[PDB]
Amino acid sequence: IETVPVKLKPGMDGPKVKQWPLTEEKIKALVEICTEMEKEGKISKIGPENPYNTPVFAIKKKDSTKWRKLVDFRELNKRTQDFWEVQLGIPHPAGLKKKKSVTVLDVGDAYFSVPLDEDFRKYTAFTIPSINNETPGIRYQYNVLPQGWKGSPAIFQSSMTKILEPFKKQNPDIVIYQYMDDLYVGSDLEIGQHRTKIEELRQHLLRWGLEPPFLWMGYELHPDKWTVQPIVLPEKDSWTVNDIQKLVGKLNWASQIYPGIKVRQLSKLLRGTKALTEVIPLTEEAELELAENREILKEPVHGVYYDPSKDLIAEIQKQGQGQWTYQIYQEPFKNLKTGKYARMRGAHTNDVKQLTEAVQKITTESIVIWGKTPKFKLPIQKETWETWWTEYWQATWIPEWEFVNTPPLVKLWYQ
């Protein structure tokens, strides 16, 4: 009810980010949402003495028909002070990734109950544009904690802990983790049980609230079943020259990750100048070297550690037929997680929708495991991505990304 003082980082002005083009349907939806938010006092019109801006658009959360306003506070979040005043941070719970079920709740509506520091409001300015710029864009700023701003869960943290105390005391084995507008609630119960504890949890908020438009939803995960991708070599009875070349190629790449990989004896099978399709019998020396490489590849990678002060990097490869491979790392060749997807999810003919869904799932896994989002290296032209990703976005956060314009050879080895 009293505002927490907030500042930007030293020597750093507010965001002045261009609003990108919006479709007619998205503009209509935002005009309706913001008219209501204005009546409720959450936002207020602003004048031309405010030159700041943050992009806004609208989405439809997974499995609903109602538009949700989404502000892209990525720039403001970079420029906002860090919040260590009461807590040097919320030590990430390592047990969350080990629960059998984790439901994600959109609790962002609760933030609207806390006023925003009067001196910081100007920096949350945004614009609803008009088609063809025929009328002046509608300019607003926030009077309360905005959804999507990193300072919102920080300022509301004291209030959230108090709301949840009765539920935590009564259910001590439940892991509850908050990231931005999301609440991740993990349990080891049978799903039927689980769904009922989640519904118990909703009521604590409804009770405190007395209506949140998306609090009823629930995104169910199962991190204990999350699959990884070790390096595996083919098992064949007939090896062509081409098969062996691909094998030696993959082993050469693996040797950057695993020390004791050897290809001497396997290369020695190719002695001469043979047709690619000619079958080569494996020598005993080559079979042994191959088996020893198999054994090496069953062990973890040496010297792999997570450092919370370094960026997480996510790379994605399109493998075809709706399949995607990805790796998360901080140092080259020190993968902290690898994976593979195959579920296009209503996108069997849209590469870009598939990639957008992959980005969201990888970000979700990254939030659960380490409590922050990775920086993506996306296999797509900037202009294509920039034009379309907002059409398929269903998360309330947005990660960072860069673009890969040269085809990686490593695609072959994660196949």
Partner 1 sequence: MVPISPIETVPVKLKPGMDGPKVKQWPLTEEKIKALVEICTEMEKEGKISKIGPENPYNTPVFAIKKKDSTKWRKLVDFRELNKRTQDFWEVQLGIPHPAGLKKKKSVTVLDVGDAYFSVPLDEDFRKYTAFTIPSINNETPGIRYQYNVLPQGWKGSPAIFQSSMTKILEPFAAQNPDIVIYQYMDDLYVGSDLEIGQHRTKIEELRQHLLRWGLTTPDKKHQKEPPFLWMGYELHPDKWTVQPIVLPEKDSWTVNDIQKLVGKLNWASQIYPGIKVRQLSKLLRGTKALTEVIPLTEEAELELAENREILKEPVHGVYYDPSKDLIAEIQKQGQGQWTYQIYQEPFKNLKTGKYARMRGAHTNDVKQLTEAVQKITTESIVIWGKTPKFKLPIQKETWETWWTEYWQATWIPEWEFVNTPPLVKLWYQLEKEPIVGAETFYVDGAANRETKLGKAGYVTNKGRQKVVPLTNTTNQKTELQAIYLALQDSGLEVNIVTDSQYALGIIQAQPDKSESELVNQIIEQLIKKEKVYLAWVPAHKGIGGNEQVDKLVSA
Residue 179 CB neighbour total at 10 angstroms: 20
Closest CA to 313 of 331, 295, 299: 331
Q: Is 311 annotated as a binding residue?
A: no
Q: Is 182 annotated as a binding residue?
A: yes
Nearer to partner 1, 112 or 376 (CB): 376
- Residue 350 touches partner 1, criterion: CB under 8 A: yes
- Cα 32 to chain centroid distance, Å, stands at 29
Binding string, residues 206-245; x marks residues near partner 1 by CB under 8 A: ----------------------------------xxx--x
Binding part of the chain for partner 1, among 66-74, 211-219, 299-307, 407-415 by CB under 8 A, reads 407-415
What's 402's DSSP letter? Answer: E
Q: What is the DSSP string of 35-78?
A: HHHHHTTSEEE--TT---BB-EEEE--TT--S-EEEE--HHHHH
Binding part of the chain for partner 1, among 2-10, 23-31, 171-179, 336-344 by CB under 8 A, reads 23-31
What's 173's DSSP letter? Answer: T
Q: Cα(165)–Cα(153) distance, rounded to whole angstroms? A: 17
Instruction: With both helix axes pointing from N to C terminus, report the angle between 151-170 and 191-209 in degrees, rounded to the nearest 10.
Output: 120
Q: Cα(146)–Cα(113) distance, rounded to whole angstroms? A: 10
Q: Which residues within the stretch 49-68 sit at the binding site for partner 1 (CB under 8 A)?
A: 49-51, 53
Nearer to partner 1, 196 or 252 (CB): 252
- Residue 10 touches partner 1, criterion: CB under 8 A: no
Q: Is 117 annotated as a binding residue?
A: no
Q: Apex CA 69: angle with CA 394 and CA 377, to 5°?
A: 40
Q: Cα(218)–Cα(241) distance, rounded to whole angstroms? A: 52
Binding part of the chain for partner 1, among 76-84, 153-161, 288-296, 349-357 by CB under 8 A, reads 349-357
Q: Which two tokens stand for residue 84?
A: 């260590």
Q: Cα(150)–Cα(135) distance, rounded to whole angstroms? A: 32
Of the candidates 1, 10, 91, 134, which one interacts with partner 1 according to CB under 8 A?
134
Closest CA to 54 of 30, 26, 77: 77
- Bridge partners, 239 (sequence order): 280
Binding string, residues 262-301; x marks residues near partner 1 by CB under 8 A: -xx--xx-xxxxxxxxx-----------------------
Residues 6+ apart with CB under 8 A from 325: 229, 316, 317, 319, 338, 339, 340, 341, 411, 414, 415
Of the candidates 93, 258, 351, 361, which one interacts with partner 1 according to CB under 8 A?
351
Nearer to partner 1, 112 or 126 (CB): 126
Nearer to partner 1, 112 or 326 (CB): 326
Q: How far is the CB of 127 from partner 1 (least distance, A)?
A: 8
Of the candidates 1, 10, 24, 65, which one interacts with partner 1 according to CB under 8 A?
24
Q: Cα(135)–Cα(141) distance, rounded to whole angstroms? A: 19
- Residue 379 touches partner 1, criterion: CB under 8 A: yes
Binding residues for Mg(2+) are 106, 181-182
Interacting residues with partner 1 (CB under 8 A): 21-24, 27, 47-51, 53, 131-137, 139, 240-242, 245, 248-249, 252, 263-264, 267-268, 270-278, 318, 320, 350-355, 378-381, 383-384, 387-388, 404, 406-407, 409, 411
